[PDB]
Nucleic acid binder design. Structure first.
Ligand SMILES: [Zn+2]
Lengths: 1320, 652
DNA sequence: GTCCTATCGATCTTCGGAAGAGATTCAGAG
DNA sequence: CTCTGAATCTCTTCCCGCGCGCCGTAGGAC
């Protein structure tokens, strides 16, 4: 085992047992790998913009006799990178350029073109791009598009009991759902009549489709029914008997011949009867005419002489009909098999309901019912029918849709065309009829084998296709009417439809979620989020328990714990840890390939449908280190059912115990001991924690942090191995070792760490370094810790020392008692960065100005303002201070005053100004500062690179004519022709000299371009001239009313900041920080937080022993002696660490990083048992009970009986009180109705709902109601007269009449209604 | 209205009127120019459809829109609807002089007080402060008074402390299903920003303090203040209007303290001595010479009010515990000692409090409740009843009970392996055997929990009730009933599929032990089913409430006696064999319909129109009366109202 | 560029609501 | 031949607050 340098600082003790055979994959690959499939061109045009184009192009005008065809598309590089684009507020996108080849053919000649015009990649639109963190920048705002989950295209069969007519019976209905086209549903009437409908239109007979498919009633009957034959030879009407057709049914009539009678009238038929009959050659048998009368014929049979219909398809025969038709010369009669249980007449029943006759009749009826108000026509009914289900423009089964369809039809082949075929619909109907006969099973709609996941690279593709369809619609007409001679492909198309479509999708779609950048965990769990909502899906208000409830196939693919409880439980899901999306779009999960009696180290991915065909061993099964199941019989799940199976019968095994959970639940320790409700609450709350100021580490984790913090994209990660050369908390420069250095490149890699920057939740996301100058790093190591991360491990909150006890009721049932020490240590203080903008527009009366010469203001408020009229950076401000000196023409004192309540430090001011208007002085100063910084950055880059390059040149010049005097004589730049033989060293020198010249020119051009960009007058788009941005930093501490929470679903607002004296202290004098309530533990069944607390105590105890051994100058050999014992303790744990190889330098470093408690890992379902917790407590001098006796600080008495004390990891949730406390006396009033405004950002009052009115009426309070609904809110005249009296001290109201009511009257008086007040 | 920049916000009605005006002007222009009949007919149809879109947009074939398929709101749309005027601005309207904040529990408050932040008090009582600044003469007018208030001058805080002296504030939590969700409180200034709420009141609001926001409204006029103090004050709402049940039922933490204080142990420090009075007993505890659960003889004195209503003092020696003798110093001077001579729990205490309201009255009852809360909190803090993994006990026989029970299922499987049983019978035998095993496991676990305590009384071991933390939490009724401790220490038991089928293989583990992956996945079914049930039923409940209020809003008690003599006969509910509720519950608080007869013949017992209060209910239960006809609101013959005699007792 | 008129006056607006209530048709029904 | 059945049509309805946060006339003629 080898430990990486980032890992080789805190060797977290692990209590796992199973060896993790497959490491957790990249957690954001769900996004990128999808968008990667989108932007990349592919000769297999499918899955990309090339697929979208081929689905549209080539496009031709039939009247025009000329086409234009797509050639290729090349994507221009983004104009602005992520940082600049976010700062300025533009979108991060790329320009799309498409080669269109306009070919003009010639009339009276073959398609030999007169001329073809290939446009050089004409501009087509701007498509947004996915940043490497997996997010899109649309308007500076950073967005994440959730992957959607919906029903896969194909055919689905469903039936219900009670929901339809309640009469015991179930109605079977089949649906055909194309990927893009019209729905087609077949259904059975309660009287077994089969009908069809399109897009849930009116019911139409099913057979009409076959009439549309040009099938005669004879053809249909032959397709669907079986033939039973009667002959008029050797006897009157003998029957061809098929003995298997008679089984179970009572033989209700005589059948006897050839000696022995098989079955007489009135008896059933069994197998031995069938065998006797088969021996009897029952090809012809005697039946009475009555049995022959009940049949229905299969074919038309006309009078051969007169040529008139004597029998027709589906015509029911009778004795006289039989005699007549046989006399006419049709001696071989064929009838339909119509066994009630087996061969129902459903198609014939539809025939009886059919009012149509033939293909013309079918088309007429289809046209009339499809388009009321539209007259049918032979040439147009085809234009409707073919477009319905056979034309590519309005029908296309996707590849996955066709695969699922063929699977549903048990076809041998899955590669089929997207358009339906006659045999396809015939097979669908046949399966439907078989299901009606009961020879099949209905599918499950909410089964993961029927619902597939659409991601960004598919929804964006569909939106692009919609845009291209609109563009084709326009340009087909343009080419039909265009002269085709002066036209060029740029004239044919305009970007506007495509640009608008993609822009709307990426800006305001239902799935273009605004990112909740509260912390790295929120980012990851939002990027891997799965939604059943959105277009083409269901809605939060029209879904029932069926789709919400969990499913036996969710195992290994969807987290059953992390769902947003509330309005949309079960509709928004989080993808499991190991799950990945199949090629077709389904979710597949890896299972260990179990071979015979051994569990191999071979991972095969199984989908939701394949999993039923196997038997899967649970991941908790033990193996004998040879791969064999130690248990003779092992519990396994086969078809949703789970039960025991014998060894060497199982076929697969889950790859890890964490395969069932998601990252949010994976981070929670002791998840096995928590009731699922509290697990859900903890998982939901963990992503709401605000990044504290000094987040350090969790004492008890699950080891998932080492991945969640790395893959979040918020921590600076070493791209290549090397040695650190310089760090200044802003830029970490690494000397990447030559083993991975490009021969011509710099060989030195910068890392410009991001400092305090506002997040989507108004939090700071600065990254701080953790490596030291000269420290070696390897590729993938975390260099700089981001927010909520420290030393490469995710750390949302702080580990507080908590005790479980009632304390005078200040922890009453949700409340939390917090010692003053934790607020003295700045345990929970956090920075909030608010952004306030002061805009200025070129109004109709003249252009506005920003100036310190504002009218009607004294120098008191101007003290913070500068000579230009903007606050000096670093000035501390409070609510009401002027931050911007704007003036409006014709003058008015419109200026940005700080919003009430908030107060903090102004740390940034960016002023974006539209040019033409002169720039204010401070804008000039800020621009000059930016330009100086950019020039300094570029110059430092070039000069450090020049130093490295010149040093390399001198190193090359060491061998090959080294001359120290001639080398240090001249400046290093005049080394063009230094003394060196006619070898390849001079060639390397010339190569590096050309490289240096290229670096010179690149430095020059980049500097000039950057200067032009910064000096550019920023585009203030809608009639606006200048905007000034201000950023305020508020260092919010923790106060009563703030909300804290554990990881085990325990939450509550802190009720008192108890001073240090009043807190309980143990016999060592150490006071506890937080006093929790015990009664909440047994009620909500979240016992996990208890055990963790106990373990946490031991986790600190080890540290308490190390710190002393560090405080006391122990010799390292002894120190190591202790630490190794703390690591080798436990069962046969998976992790094994030998501290000997640490050379005592890494030992001392680890101790310096361990003296604050040894971090411990407790995997989700492979966690530490109580025995190991007791053993670890025994290693320290701590009590093995877990409970200690405490002393009340106020009275010095000892609490009766010991109490539980430990270190619980607590998180400050983002629901602090100062964002929610509000009160209104008098202020803004709404216009249409004079009721007060509503909200916090507006000075509004609380809404007095109808329930409150009912409650007031429940008491006898009438004056209270009258005041509350007339004076306080509605009566404009009254609420002033009340104001005067209250100031005057009269306390009397004049109610009048609520103005809103009068408005209602006008709304009714605006109609043809005369409603008015009355006197008497 | 304009928006940011030189543009005006789109108005729905304006566009409909514009369409109508344009179409009508076109029709007028044509009719002036004599357009052909076809054209004028088409214009008239378009005008009619435009008027249709203006009036009730949506009743047309398709609503018109000027955006991404967002139909325009019409006049009829604005009139009705959940966002319409009726339910948006008339029935419920936003009110000035109100605010909201996150609440927190202040145990020091009296029953009739609540703490509010100084900032919120200043921002709600602003005009009242002005009303003093002029009256004090400290400010010239409003112009200087507002400035001084902004200056937050230290004198302004004195003005606030004078204004807020006796001015009630209304507190209501959203939602407010019943009238007890809105109450008046006398405010007290608090430094912080959270609203200090009383513990005993939090039950009425259903207020968990896990970040729960709550709103305050300031009654301004004189009549509003008086109405708040007389009808909505906390101390005026001690009985629930839905049934004769107090709403000040002792909280979860307080009852734990009382249960811990009054419990008795076999052998304890300070046992068996004689105490001259309750006060001395307290001293002993605070000097540390005696244990709270020690058994002792203290001289008790109690007062009993005669039939006329004057207290009679009686003093005696009583065998009791030190905790009970200490608590007796709080119980008012009208109750028997037998109420406190027992280990009190959330049930046993409640009737106690109720008995006070039955005897002493409202004013003694409220102070007694406050003292009970104080004592409970203090002695629960002294208890330190922590909870730990050591307290969850797994009975040792459990492994055997499983090892046998599964084997029995094997036998039921063996029959299925031999064809000796049907498919369904195997299922319904296995599930029943598992249920019996679960019952055995639960009984063994409970027996072990209570038996885990055995103590030596000067010689030989003797068992007693268990001081186990979980056991005291469950037995006191605070939290964690038997179904909780059974899942925490017995076995989780059977589960159900989303289709409701009983799982053949129960969750044989308990949360103290680890649940495996499959067991947790099985539990997720029931967890999500319950969560979805809550999220879906929270809407139907509210809709039913709205229907009820809008069907019954008219009825008011508007007359004393209607004079009728009919009614409805009340009998105990006897169904499924034994009775499910007594006669007293039905008939208490109503008036008799006719003269109540003695059990037998020709002898009456109660007058024909007498209210059957508690004493007469006891008198009836003394006799063998099962059917009693009493007047009912349905039968009362009062026009456009309901007579008072039919409705009877006001339950609050 | 400004400012205009008009609003699928050559499409297909979504199929993942349930129910509950009338209102409106039809159907043997004499 | 309609009457007095069902059956098949359309319309109405769906808890309370509270916060974020974006997003918000269009194409065509002088
Ligand atoms: Zn009455």
């Amino acid at each position: 085992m080898v430990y990486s340098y980032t890992e080789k600082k805190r060797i977290r003790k692990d209590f796992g047992k199973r060896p993790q055979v497959l490491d957790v994959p990249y957690l954001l690959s769900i996004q990128l790998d999808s968008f990667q499939k989108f932007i990349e061109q592919d000769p297999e045009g499918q899955y990309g913009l090339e697929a979208a184009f081929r689905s549209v192009f080539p496009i031709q005008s039939y009247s025009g006799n000329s086409e234009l065809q797509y050639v290729s598309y090349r994507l221009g590089e983004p104009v602005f990178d992520v940082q600049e684009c976010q700062i300025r507020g533009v979108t991060y996108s790329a320009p799309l350029r498409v080669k269109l080849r306009l070919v003009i053919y010639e009339r009276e000649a073959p398609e030999g073109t007169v001329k073809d015009i290939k446009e050089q990649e004409v501009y087509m639109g701007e498509i947004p791009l996915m940043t490497d963190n997996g997010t899109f920048v649309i308007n500076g705002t950073e967005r994440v598009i959730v992957s959607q989950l919906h029903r896969s295209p194909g055919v689905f069969f469903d039936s219900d009991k009670g929901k339809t007519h309640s009469s015991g019976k179930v109605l079977y209905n089949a649906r055909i759902i194309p990927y893009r086209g019209s729905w087609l549903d077949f259904e059975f009437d309660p009287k077994d009549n089969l009908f069809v409908r399109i897009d849930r239109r009116r019911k139409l007979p099913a057979t009409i489709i076959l009439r549309a498919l040009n099938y005669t009633t004879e053809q249909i009957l032959d397709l669907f029914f079986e033939k039973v034959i009667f002959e008029i030879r050797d006897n009157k009407l003998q029957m061809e008997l098929v003995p298997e057709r008679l089984r179970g049914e009572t033989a209700s009539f005589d059948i006897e011949a050839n000696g022995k009678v098989y079955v007489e009238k009135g008896r059933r038929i069994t197998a031995r009867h069938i065998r006797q009959l088969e021996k009897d050659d029952v090809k012809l048998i005697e039946v009475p005419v009555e049995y022959i009368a009940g049949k229905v014929v299969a074919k038309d049979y006309i009078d051969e002489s007169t040529g008139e219909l004597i029998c027709a398809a589906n015509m029911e025969l009778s004795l006289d009909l039989l005699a007549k038709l046989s006399q006419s010369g049709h001696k071989r009669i064929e009838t339909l098999f119509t066994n009630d249980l087996d061969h129902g007449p459903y198609i014939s029943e539809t025939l009886r309901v059919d009012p149509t006759n033939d293909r013309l009749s079918a088309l007429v009826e289809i046209y009339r019912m499809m388009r009321p108000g539209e007259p049918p026509t032979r040439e147009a009914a085809e234009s409707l029918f073919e477009n319905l289900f056979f034309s590519e423009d309005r029908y296309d089964l996707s590849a996955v849709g066709r695969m699922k369809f063929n699977r549903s039809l048990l076809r041998e082949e899955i590669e089929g065309s997207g358009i339906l075929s006659k045999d396809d619909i015939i097979d669908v109907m046949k399966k439907l009829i078989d299901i009606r006969n009961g020879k099949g099973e209905v599918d499950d709609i909410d089964h993961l084998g029927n619902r597939r996941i659409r991601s960004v690279g598919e929804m964006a593709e569909n939106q692009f296709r919609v845009g291209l369809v609109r563009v084709e619609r326009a340009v087909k007409e343009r080419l039909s009417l265009g002269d085709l001679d002066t036209l060029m492909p740029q004239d044919m198309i305009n970007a506007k439809p495509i640009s608008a479509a993609v822009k709307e999708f990426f800006g305001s779609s239902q799935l273009s979620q605004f990112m909740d950048q509260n912390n790295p965990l929120s980012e990851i769990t939002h990027k891997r989020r799965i939604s059943a909502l959105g277009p083409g899906g269901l809605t939060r208000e029209r879904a029932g328990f069926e789709v919400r409830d969990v499913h036996p196939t969710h195992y290994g693919r969807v987290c059953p714990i992390e769902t947003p409880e509330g309005p949309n439980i079960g509709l928004i899901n989080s993808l499991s840890v190991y799950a990945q999306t199949n090629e077709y779009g389904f979710l597949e999960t890896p299972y260990r390939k179990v071979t015979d009696g051994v569990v191999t180290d071979e991972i095969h991915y199984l989908s939701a449908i394949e999993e039923g065909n196997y038997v899967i061993a649970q991941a908790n099964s033990n193996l004998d280190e040879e791969g064999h199941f130690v248990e003779d019989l092992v519990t396994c799940r086969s078809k949703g059912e789970s039960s025991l199976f014998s060894r060497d019968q199982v076929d697969y095994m889950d790859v890890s115990t964490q395969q069932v959970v998601s990252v949010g639940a994976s981070l929670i320790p002791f998840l096995e001991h928590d009731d699922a409700n509290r697990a859900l609450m903890g998982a939901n709350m963990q992503r709401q924690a605000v990044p504290t100021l000094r987040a350090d580490k969790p004492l008890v984790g699950t080891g998932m942090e080492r991945a969640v913090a790395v893959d979040s994209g918020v921590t600076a990660v070493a791209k290549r191995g090397g040695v650190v050369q310089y760090v200044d908390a802003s830029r970490i420069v690494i000397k990447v070792n030559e083993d991975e250095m490009y021969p011509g490149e710099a060989g030195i890699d910068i890392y410009n760490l991001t400092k305090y920057t506002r997040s989507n939740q108004n939090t700071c996301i600065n990254q701080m370094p953790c490596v030291s100058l000269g420290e070696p790093v390897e590729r993938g190591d975390v260099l700089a810790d981001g927010p909520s991360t420290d030393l490469g491990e995710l750390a949302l909150g702080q580990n507080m020392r908590v005790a479980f006890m009632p304390w005078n009721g200040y922890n009453f049932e949700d409340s939390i008692l917090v010692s003053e020490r934790v607020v003295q240590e700045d345990r929970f203080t956090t920075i909030h960065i608010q952004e306030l903008a002061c805009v200025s527009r070129d109004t109709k009366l003249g252009p506005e100005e920003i100036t310190a010469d504002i009218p009607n203001v004294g120098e008191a408020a101007l003290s913070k303002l500068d000579e230009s009229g903007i606050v000096y950076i670093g000035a501390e401000v409070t609510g009401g201070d002027i931050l911007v000196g704007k003036v409006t023409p014709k003058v008015k004192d419109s200026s940005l005053r700080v919003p009430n309540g908030v107060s903090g430090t102004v740390i940034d001011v960016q002023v974006f100004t539209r040019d033409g208007v002169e720039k204010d002085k401070r804008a000039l100063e800020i621009e000059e500062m930016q330009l100086k910084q950019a020039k300094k950055d570029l110059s430092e880059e070039l000069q450090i690179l020049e130093a490295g390059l010149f040093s390399r040149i001198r190193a090359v010049l060491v061998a090959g004519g080294v001359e120290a005097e001639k080398l240090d004589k001249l400046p290093r730049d005049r080394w063009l022709e230094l003394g060196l033989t006619d070898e390849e060293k001079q060639n390397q020198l010339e190569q590096l000299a050309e490289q240096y010249d290229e670096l010179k020119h690149e430095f020059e051009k980049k500097l000039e371009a950057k200067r032009r960009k910064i000096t550019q007058g920023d585009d203030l788009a809608p009639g606006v001239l200048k905007i000034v941005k201000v950023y305020l930093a508020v260092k919010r501490r923790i106060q009563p009313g703030d909300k804290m929470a554990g990881r085990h679903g325990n939450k509550g607002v802190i009720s008192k900041i108890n001073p240090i004296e009043d807190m309980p202290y143990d016999e060592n004098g150490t006071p506890v920080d937080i006093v929790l309530n015990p009664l909440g533990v047994p009620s909500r069944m979240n016992i996990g937080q208890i055990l963790e607390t106990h373990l946490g105590m031991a986790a600190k105890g080890i540290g308490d022993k190390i710190n002393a051994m560090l405080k006391q100058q122990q010799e390292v050999a002894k120190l190591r002696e202790f630490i190794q014992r703390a690591y080798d303790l436990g069962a046969d744990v998976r992790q094994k660490v030998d501290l000997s190889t640490f050379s005592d330098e890494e030992v001392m470093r680890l101790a310096e990083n361990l003296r604050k408690g040894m971090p411990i890992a407790t995997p989700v379902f492979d966690g530490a048992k109580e025995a190991e917790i007791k053993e670890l407590l025994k290693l320290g001098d701590l009590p093995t009970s877990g409970q200690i006796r405490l002393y009340d600080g106020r009275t010095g008495e000892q609490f009766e009986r010991p109490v539980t004390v430990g270190y619980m990891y607590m998180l400050k949730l983002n629901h602090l009180v100062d964002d929610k406390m509000h009160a209104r006396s008098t202020g803004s009033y709404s216009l249409v109705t004079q009721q007060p405004l509503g909200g916090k950002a507006q000075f509004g009052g609380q809404r007095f709902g109808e329930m409150e009115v009912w409650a007031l009426e429940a008491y006898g309070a009438a004056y209270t109601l009258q005041e509350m609904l007339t004076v306080k809110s509605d009566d404009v005249n009254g609420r002033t007269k009340m104001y005067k009296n209250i100031v005057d001290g009269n306390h009397q109201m004049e109610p009048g009449m609520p103005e809103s009511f009068n408005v209602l009257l006008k709304e009714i008086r605006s109609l043809g209604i005369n409603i008015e007040l009355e006197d008497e | 209205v304009p928006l940011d920049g030189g543009r005006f916000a789109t108005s729905d009605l304006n566009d409909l009127y514009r369409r109508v005006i344009n179409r009508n002007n076109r029709l007028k222009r044509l009719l002036d120019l004599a357009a052909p009949d076809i054209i004028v007919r088409n214009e008239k149809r378009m005008l009619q459809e435009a008027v249709d879109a203006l009036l009730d947009n949506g009743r047309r074939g398709r609503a018109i829109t000027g955006s991404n398929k967002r139909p325009l709101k019409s006049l009829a749309d604005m009139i009705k609807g959940k966002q319409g005027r009726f339910r948006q601005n008339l029935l419920g309207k936003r009110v000035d002089y109100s605010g909201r904040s996150v609440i927190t529990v202040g145990p020091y408050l009296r029953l009739h007080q609540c703490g509010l932040p100084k900032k919120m008090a200043l921002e709600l009582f602003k005009p009242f402060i002005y009303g003093k600044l002029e009256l004090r003469g400290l400010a010239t007018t409003i112009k200087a008074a507002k400035k001084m208030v902004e200056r937050e001058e230290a004198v302004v805080w004195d003005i606030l402390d004078e204004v807020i002296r006796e001015h009630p504030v209304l507190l209501n939590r959203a939602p407010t299903l019943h009238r007890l969700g809105i109450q008046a409180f006398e405010p007290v200034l608090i430094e912080g920003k959270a609203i200090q709420l009383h513990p005993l009141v939090c039950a009425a609001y259903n207020a968990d303090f896990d970040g729960d926001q709550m709103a305050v409204h300031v009654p301004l006029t004189l009549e509003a203040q008086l109405e708040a103090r007389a009808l909505m004050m906390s101390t005026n709402n001690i009985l629930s209007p839905a049934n004769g049940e107090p709403i000040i039922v002792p909280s979860q933490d307080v009852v734990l303290g009382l249960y811990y204080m009054t419990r008795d142990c076999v052998n304890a420090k300070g046992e068996g001595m004689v105490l001259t009075g309750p006060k001395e007993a307290e001293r002993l505890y605070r000097s540390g010479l005696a244990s709270l659960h020690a058994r002792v003889k203290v001289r008790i004195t109690e007062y009993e009010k005669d039939a006329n209503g004057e207290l009679v003092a009686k003093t005696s020696l009583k065998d009791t515990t030190v905790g009970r003798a200490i608590l007796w110093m709080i119980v008012p001077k009208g109750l028997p000692y037998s109420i406190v001579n027992q280990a009190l729990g959330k049930k046993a205490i409640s009737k106690m409090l109720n008995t006070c309201y039955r005897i002493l009255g409202l004013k003694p009852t409220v102070i007694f409740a406050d003292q009970i809360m104080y004592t409970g909190f203090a002695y629960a803090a002294r208890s330190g009843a922590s909870v730990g993994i050591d307290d969850m006990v797994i009975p040792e026989k459990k492994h055997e009970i499983i090892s046998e029970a599964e084997a029995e299922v094997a036998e039921i499987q063996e029959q299925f392996q031999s064809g000796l049983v049907t498919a369904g019978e195997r299922y319904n035998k296995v599930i029943d055997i598992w249920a019996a095993a679960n019952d055995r496991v639960s009984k063994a676990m409970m027996d072990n929990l209570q038996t885990e305590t055995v103590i030596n009384r000067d010689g030989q071991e003797e068992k007693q009730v268990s001081f186990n933390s979980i056991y005291m939490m469950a037995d006191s009724g605070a939290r964690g009933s038997a179904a909780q401790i059974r899942q925490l220490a017995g076995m989780r038991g059977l589960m159900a599929k989303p289709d409701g089928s009983i799982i053949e293989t129960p969750i044989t583990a308990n949360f103290r032990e680890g649940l495996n992956v499959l067991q947790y996945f099985i539990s997720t079914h029931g967890a999500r089913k319950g969560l979805a049930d809550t999220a879906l039923k929270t809407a139907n409940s509210g809709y039913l409430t709205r229907r009820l209020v809008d069907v019954a809003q008219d009825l008011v008690v508007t007359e004393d006696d209607c004079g009728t003599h009919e009614g409805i006969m009340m009998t105990p509910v006897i169904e499924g064999g034994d009775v499910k509720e007594p006669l007293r519950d039905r008939v208490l608080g109503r008036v008799t319909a006719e003269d109540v007869l003695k059990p037998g013949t020709a002898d009456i017992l109660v007058p024909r129109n007498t209210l059957l209060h508690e004493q007469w209910c006891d008198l009836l239960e003394e006799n063998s009366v099962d059917a009693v006809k009493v007047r009912s609101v349905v039968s009362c013959d009062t026009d456009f109202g309901v007579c008072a005699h039919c409705y009877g007792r006001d339950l609050a």
